[PDB]
Amino acid sequence: RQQQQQLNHEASELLEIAHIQDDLLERLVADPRIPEERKAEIEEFLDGPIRTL
Amino acid sequence: QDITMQWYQQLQDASMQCVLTFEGLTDSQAKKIKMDLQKAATIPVSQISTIAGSKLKEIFDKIHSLLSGKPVQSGGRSVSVTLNPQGLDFVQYKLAEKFVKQGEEEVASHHEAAFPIAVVASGIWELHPRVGDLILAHLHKKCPYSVPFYPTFKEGMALEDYQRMLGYQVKDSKVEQQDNFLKRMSGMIRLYAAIIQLRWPYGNRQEIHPHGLNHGWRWLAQILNMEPLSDVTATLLFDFLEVCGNALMKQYQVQFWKMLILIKEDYFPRIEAITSSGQMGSFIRLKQFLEKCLQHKDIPVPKGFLTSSFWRS
Secondary structure, X not given: OHHHHHHXXXXXXXXXXXXXXXXXXXXXXXXXXXOHHHHHHHHHHHOOOOXXX | XXXXXXXXXXXXXXXXXXXXXXXXXXXXXXXXXXXXXXXOOOHHHHOHHHOOOOOHHHHHHHHHHHHHOOOEEOOOOEEOOOOOHHHHHHHHHHHHHHHHHHHHHOOOOOHHHHHHHHHHXXXXXXXXXXXXXXXXXXXXXXXXXXXXXXXOOOOOOOHHHHHHHOOOOEOOOOEOOOHHHHXXXXXXXXXXXXXXXXXXXXXXXXXXXXXXXXXXXXXHHHHHOOOOOOOHHHHHHHHHHHHHHHHHHHHOHHHHHHHHHHHHHHHHHHHHHHOOHHHOHHHHHHHHHHHHHHHHOOOOOOOOOOOHHHHHO
């Protein structure tokens, strides 16, 4: 049970961070006040491995 | 861009054929005639910025009369072109260049003057298409960025000769500055961006625009499909969309916005890499102009656009 919970906990935390990152990326791309040049740069660094908080 | 450069060469070498047709115009009275035509063919264009729209038709007819064969008042004595085949070919050349010089030394200083000059150039082009090809010839040489084409630095030719191709005004001594050169280039395409959208109202014209608004779509497409120059591109792009973005939005509803939600994502990051922070003035205002338009979903009418109130008083 200990080994199960430790993995379910690591997946729960990483999923919480991933959803934050997805909410950010979506909002930044859609934001009218963001220049196009920057958006492509945001999509490169956020649409991949999960970043630190 | 072979298709465009071929057409570019045609207007260029075809104007050069005109350089050859009146070489005989280059006696005591023969010099008086050359001045009288060069004079009575460039003063009217210089007054287009300083007149009331109710009176602006006077200059159009005065240009149309002189150019169609009729006489016109220049000073005290009357001038004509009838039975003056070199004078006719001579006036079309100086007229076409004066339209560009005005976009070079007046529209650069005052952006509002592009529209009253564009309508008159658009109506004369409409009635006399040869004058229009000469208008494109000088516009192209003095401003290659209006073709559009970026001239490349070449080996085997002097540096000064290459700087002239870029449109830098050079006296025999030295080249002109860059800040005054960017203004000359702006004013020239704000004039051109106004020509491709405005139409001379009077005359009851059945036919199509001489140089239609179609040439405005390709120009934007043709400069965004090539790598941008550091400062020119970001400047000329702004003062083109501000002048002709409204007329381009109406004609191409969805296709223009797709092209506009593209520069923000793809072409804007490209300009940040090539330009140092010291000369970002072009790219920084290129975004201030959009961010409003993007959320407003509308491009303001160019400040200085002609309205009906202009044509009555």
